[PDB]
Design a protein around this ligand. Structure first.
Ligand code: HEM
Ligand SMILES: C=C1/C(=C\C=C2/CCC[C@]3(C)[C@@H]([C@H](C)CCCC(C)(C)O)CC[C@@H]23)C[C@@H](O)C[C@@H]1O
Length: 404
């Protein structure tokens, strides 16, 4: 057995949060360490780089020498489950220019400022509908299953043209896919979603329908400009991203704001602060903090350190968002600060497609909770909650809440 000191210069990565709104101890360690880059050891024993500073993160996310090719052998997979991404055709998140651009542009029209603005009445209706259903069901509710998840689910389903009648199926499959612990479990959830989306495509070919999937079938698919499997992958990416991210932000935002009563009170008293508070919560909670995996296709020198071709690089936006040279006292929640320039949504060509939809949803959600249920509180201590591991989208699967 090992009879010598166990200190390493390439710590295990990722790490799990112990506090919903604070970096794992190991991540705080990396944040405090000088230099833009640090060595880590991934689950499979391979070494990769992490990017741990704000400006360096922007630079590297903008660098065309860092590929998003998830089918590349050297891609820094963070868990066994990740191996189900490199099994089907890639959605544009796993593509590089010029392929990335041709696919992304097929979807952008649904996420424009004009369209997002137009969605506000719809989002407000959905939020208040699930809210008054939960409240009528009586206190001691799970905010996740009863509010946090169904809200963005219904909204993204309308955008895509996915029938909400099938929600129990695809919500379950989404959770199984994103939170899968092994490759086999992930592949099964993917195959389940794929078969369903495949059926929807055939339905659309017979009888055209509304939504992005409807449009892609009638247009790009009919022209052979997108492969059928690519359409499935694209729809799956938007469906899952649309579900899981906003849900995670809602639940973690509630926990975080309840732990900062003075700021939450301030928020209630002046709703002009909500858009700014949403940005701060995005910066602070960074729920997709390892959604910045890359592979170097050429040598890259970064402030005296060399990233070699073939090496994996993960841009860790939670750590980058806690860069004290950009955000004064970075580990303090401050809804009054400028959280502008944060990396919660990434940067560059792969910068979050849904970011303005997420902003709208969270603004509507927070205003709704403050309007309708100002006495919302956790029904269990924060210590009794179970946080998801650092290998997946950050959040809680259950959030016991009560009110008066
Ligand atoms: C709720 C807060 C959200 C956060 C924190 C978040 C985070 C991120 C991050 C960090 C990326 C960059 C990934 C990379 O560079 O590899 C990304 C990309 C993406 N996100 Fe978001 N996301 C959120 C909400 C959403 C929503 C609601 C949608 C709706 C469809 C969405 C759809 C997408 C898509 C399609 C991409 C890939 C963009 C591309 O590769 O060109 N996201 N997201
Ligand atoms: C939806 C898609 C697919 C898989 C998504 C998965 C499967 C494996 C585990 C993943 C990649 C989860 C990750 C463990 C979450 C951590 C963030 C990350 C490692 C991606 O930074 C989130 C989504 C999950 C199938 C693909 O065909 C389309 C789309 O691409």
């Amino acid at each position: 057995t090992a009879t010598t000191p166990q200190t390493t210069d390439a710590p295990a990565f990722p790490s799990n949060r112990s506090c919903p709104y604070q970096l794992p101890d190991g991540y705080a360690q990396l944040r405090d360490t000088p230099g833009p880059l640090h060595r880590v050891t991934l689950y499979d024993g391979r070494q990769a780089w992490v990017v741990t500073k704000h400006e360096a993160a922007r630079k590297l996310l903008g660098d065309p020498r860092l590929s998003s090719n998830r089918t590349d052998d050297n891609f820094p997979a963070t868990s066994p489950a990740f191996e189900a991404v490199r099994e089907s055709p890639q959605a544009f998140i796993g593509l590089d220019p010029p392929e990335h651009g041709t696919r992304r542009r097929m979807t952008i029209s649904e996420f424009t400022v004009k369209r997002i603005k137009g969605m506000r009445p719809e989002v407000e209706e959905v939020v208040h509908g699930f809210l008054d259903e939960m409240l009528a069901a009586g206190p001691t509710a799970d905010l996740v299953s009863q509010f946090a998840l169904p809200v963005p689910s219904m909204v993204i389903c309308r955008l895509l043209g996915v029938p909400y009648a099938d929600h129990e199926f695809f919500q379950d499959a989404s959770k199984r896919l994103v939170q899968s612990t092994d490759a086999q479990s992930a592949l099964t959830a993917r195959n389940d979603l794929a078969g369903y989306l495949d059926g929807l495509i055939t339905q659309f070919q017979t009888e055209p329908g509304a939504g992005l999937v409807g449009a892609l079938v009638a247009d790009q698919l009919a022209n052979g400009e997108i492969d059928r499997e690519e359409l499935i992958s694209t729809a799956m990416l938007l469906l899952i991203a649309g579900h899981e991210t906003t849900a995670s932000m809602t639940s973690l935002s509630v926990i975080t704001l309840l732990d900062h009563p003075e700021q939450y009170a301030a928020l209630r008293a002046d709703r002009s602060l909500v858009p700014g508070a949403v940005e701060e919560l995005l910066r602070y909670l960074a729920i997709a903090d390892i959604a910045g995996g890359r592979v170097a296709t050429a040598d890259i020198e970064v402030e005296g350190q060399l990233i070699r071709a073939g090496e994996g690089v993960i841009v860790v936006n939670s750590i980058a968002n806690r860069d004290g040279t950009v955000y004064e006292d970075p580990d303090a929640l401050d809804i009054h600060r400028s959280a502008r320039h944060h990396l919660a949504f990434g940067f560059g060509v792969h910068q979050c497609l849904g970011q303005n939809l997420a902003r709208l949803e969270l603004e509507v959600i927070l205003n709704a909770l403050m309007d309708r249920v100002p006495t919302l509180r956790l029904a269990v201590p924060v210590e009794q909650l179970v946080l998801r591991p650092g290998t997946t989208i950050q959040g809680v699967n259950e959030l016991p809440v009560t009110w008066h």
